[PDB]
Amino acid sequence: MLEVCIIGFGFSAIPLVRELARTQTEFQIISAESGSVWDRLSESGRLDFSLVSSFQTSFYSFDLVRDYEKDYYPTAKQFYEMHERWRSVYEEKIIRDFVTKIENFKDYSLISTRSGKTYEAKHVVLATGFDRLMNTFLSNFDNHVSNKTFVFDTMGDSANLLIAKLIPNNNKIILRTNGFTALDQEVQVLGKPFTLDQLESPNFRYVSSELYDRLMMSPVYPRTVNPAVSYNQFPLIRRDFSWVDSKSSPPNGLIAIKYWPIDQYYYHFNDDLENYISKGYLLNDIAMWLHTGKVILVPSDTPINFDKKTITYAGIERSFHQYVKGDAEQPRLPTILINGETPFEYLYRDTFMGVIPQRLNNIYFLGYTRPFTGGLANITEMQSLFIHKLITQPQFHQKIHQNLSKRITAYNQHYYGAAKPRKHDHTVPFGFYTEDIARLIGIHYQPNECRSVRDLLFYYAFPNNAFKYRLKGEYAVDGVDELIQKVNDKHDHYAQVFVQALSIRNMNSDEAAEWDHSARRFSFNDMRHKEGYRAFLDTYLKAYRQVENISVDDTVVDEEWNFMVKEACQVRDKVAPNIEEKTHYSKDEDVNKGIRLILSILDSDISEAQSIEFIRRLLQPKNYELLFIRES
């Protein structure tokens, strides 16, 4: 009888199928003829956008070792073409059918399909993706609508893309909001560009969770009074974070939108705008929309008349063309019967690492963990190794399952505290998840085995991408050595991120907050770098309309709209004039001097002197314990 049956083949299943093939483990795939959202967009000519995740976190290690030459954000078209490439490789192992039920028994599961053919398999892996009504809404969007008003009740990456397609046709956008977290998907470090996933250095949580909190959360929590940051100019973007009860930050369950800042979009695309726009690189700078009044934030209880399609704000009954509210993504799971009898209910927090449900036997979930930043590939590549190791090695299967409920309890205590399960529990920081899985599999690194300072840069500062853990050991991929070499050379061995931690080692969280925003351009939501691109924004809108073959009238200054903009930006108009011109930009000075210190001792063996003390203390970090990794 079959050893492994995989249900669903799109993107998440790729690395697991690759490993089962290499161990020549018997397996079968069943995926529906229907296809994915990527197929639907392909079939309607709608793959004209880009990923919000960098290439090095969005493509699998066995592609990166062949294809990586620089950091960049691939297009949707590039993403899907990689999906299809791998489908052509394994299509002979795919039965085109739709799974309707799984009866889970002691040794095996009985799988049913719509064609009526049944299958028996010892191990069952589900990688079927998620449902979103927002997908159908993008597949039916008319991008030639112009001179209209739109009302949004949710803000997310899908909503942000629609706003980017609506802005150039002179459409006005109203956001009825209880706040959202937005982050520049690319930032500058002493002028040079870094995708945000490059600057997370997540293993510094092992030094101290308080130090790691100071490294990451001042752009998310309103910790600085600096009047240049968007959460001071537009306080309706602030969310109610009272649910957070973990000492691990960024907390599991936090989601952010990643967007092109206009200064970085200009840097990359201004010399060939019409071509870049047509390739899928669209300007989606929400901070620029608020700055210019093209998007306004209004209180979440602003009244809407759905009968008349009006919304009333600033004393104005504003008629609107369309109202938009996105649904909750739910996973696409078939009916699963505990013991062939009891319906199973999915709950992310009641599974181990989002993969192992504790009510079932030999059933695994692949692709249902979401990364807080970067691509899903980092997550699904590590999940695939975990799953493959579970399927093919009984000693590991037993070592994990013998205390499964206790591992889940300790995991949840660490990352959720006493919070009730939330809809977004499945979102995790990618460098915590890949490192968590690595330590479970045993392909992690050990902080105490670093010899030189260059070793400490790799352990702590080099991003915890899946390929980081595939240089040596059980899941080693050929070519990973040159890839890490390329990445280090191209990012100066990540000395810049390492120096950030050193600069804040003795600050409290408010000192750290103001230090983050003392740079000439701080990483995220710097409102000082918007007005200077007003001219370019007009060039962008003209070029966008040329690509879309549309004629649009911008002569009518919407006076009603201008009035509503003025009402909505009163805090901005008060705090923005407080923006200071400094003599010293403290963060820029500290990072330059810290980088020059590190590159002079890069090759020194572990043997300012207070920085020396800090660096030597990285060999035995005292917050290294993760109790869900142990077998008691």
Ligand SMILES: Cc1cc2nc3c(=O)[nH]c(=O)nc-3n(C[C@H](O)[C@H](O)[C@H](O)COP(=O)(O)OP(=O)(O)OC[C@H]3O[C@@H](n4cnc5c(N)ncnc54)[C@H](O)[C@@H]3O)c2cc1C
């Ligand atoms: C608009 C949009 C933009 C995105 N952008 C990014 C991005 O920039 N970066 C990123 O990392 N991720 C992004 N994602 C995430 C994206 O969902 C994943 O990267 C990927 O598409 C999901 O892979 P999957 O294999 O898990 O699901 P899918 O690709 O949806 O594959 C699941 C497959 O299983 C099939 N299937 C489902 N149920 C059954 C069943 N019962 N029986 C048989 N077959 C079944 C489906 O038909 C489908 O073919 C985006 C998602 C969307 C919707």
Ligand SMILES: N[C@@H](Cc1c[nH]c2ccccc12)C(=O)O
């Ligand atoms: N540590 C870097 C990058 C960073 C901060 N907060 C983040 C949140 C998410 C991703 C990256 C970051 C900085 O302070 O600029």
